[PDB]
């Protein structure tokens, strides 16, 4: 795990990580695919109760990505988005 991600991911409980993984898993053929598309990214986030804006999704992709998102990238983007609730 990348050390910077490792600390975003430290915000999450084991249970949150498990929940987040179950939602992510809906959007891949896990037997052969480890990444969701950038279009699916907002879908999985919204499944988990987040409401990222279109500019924000592109910004997170620019800043987090190592057109695709794997599970740890997804966790970091969830953590970022969870901090913009009002
Ligand atoms: Ca729970
Ligand atoms: Ca659940």
UniProtKB/Swiss-Prot annotation:
Residues 16-51, 52-84 form the EF-hand domain. The keyword Phosphoprotein applies. The modification N-acetylmethionine is found at residue 1. One of its GO terms (biological process) is ventricular cardiac muscle tissue morphogenesis. GO terms for molecular function: actin filament binding; calcium ion binding; calcium-dependent protein binding; protein homodimerization activity; troponin I binding; troponin T binding. Keywords: Acetylation, Calcium, Cardiomyopathy, Disease variant, Metal-binding, Muscle protein, Phosphoprotein, Repeat. One of its GO terms (cellular component) is cytosol. It comes from the Eukaryota. Ca(2+) 1 binds at residues 65, 68, 73. It is linked to Cardiomyopathy, dilated, 1Z: A disorder characterized by ventricular dilation and impaired systolic function, resulting in congestive heart failure and arrhythmia. Patients are at risk of premature death. Cardiac muscle Tn-C can bind 3 calcium ions per molecule. Domain I does not bind calcium. Troponin is the central regulatory protein of striated muscle contraction. Tn consists of three components: Tn-I which is the inhibitor of actomyosin ATPase, Tn-T which contains the binding site for tropomyosin and Tn-C. The binding of calcium to Tn-C abolishes the inhibitory action of Tn on actin filaments. Belongs to the troponin C family. This is Troponin C, slow skeletal and cardiac muscles. It comes from Homo sapiens.
